[PDB]
Write a structure and sequence with these properties.
Elements lengths: L2 E4 L19 H8 L3 E4 L1 H4 L9 E4 L2 E4 L6 H18 L3 E3 L11 E3 L7 E3 L3 H8 L3 E3 L4 H10 L4
Parallel strand pairs: 1-2, 1-5, 5-8
Antiparallel strand pairs: 3-4, 6-7
The structure holds iron/sulfur cluster and hydrosulfuric acid.
PDB class: transferase
Keywords: thiouracil, iron-sulfur cluster, desulfuration, sulfurtransferase, transferase
Assembly: monomeric
Length: 153
């Protein structure tokens, strides 16, 4: 089976600051070598540029510090992630922690003050609502196990 992965976790320079969040993982490298780790960046897919200003959720809305509302792009990117999972038969996602799109256990609190809180990004929320299990880069053993359990079926 294949998984969808935040493109930044695969070393792609698609982060809001033009950086990457490439993780060191023999398991993830091997999965990619087998063609089973499909890269996806909801913000770029949703039409946002790179670089782009930091954004935080404010409930259903997603805004930048200047007040620009980018919810349209965030929601488009989330739908496109779901569309790729449905088309490819994907039921597991490995998404970047803390992001207003990809966060799964934590997100910034919407006050633009460097304070995190329990929560999830727009893309994680939509995927979970449709039965797709989302794991962060802090849960690689858990994700690898979940994917391994269905291997011989
Ligand atoms: S939207 Fe998600 S995949 Fe794209 S750069 Fe941000 S954290 Fe990574
Ligand atoms: S990002």
């Amino acid at each position: 089976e294949k998984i969808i992965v935040s493109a930044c976790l695969l070393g792609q320079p698609v982060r809001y600051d033009g950086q990457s969040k490439g993780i060191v993982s023999n398991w993830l490298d091997a999965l990619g070598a087998e063609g089973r780790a499909l890269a996806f960046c909801p913000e770029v897919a949703g039409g946002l540029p790179t670089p782009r200003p930091p954004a935080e959720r404010q409930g259903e809305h997603v805004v930048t510090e200047s007040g620009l509302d980018v919810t349209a792009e965030f929601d488009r990117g989330a739908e496109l992630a779901l569309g790729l999972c449905l088309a490819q038969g994907i039921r597991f996602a490995l998404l970047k922690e803390g992001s207003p799109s990809c966060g799964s256990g934590r997100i910034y609190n919407g006050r633009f003050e460097g304070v995190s809180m329990a929560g999830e990004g727009k893309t994680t929320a939509l995927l979970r609502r449709h039965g797709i299990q989302v794991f962060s880069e802090d849960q690689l053993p858990e994700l690898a196990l979940a994917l391994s359990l269905v291997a011989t079926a």
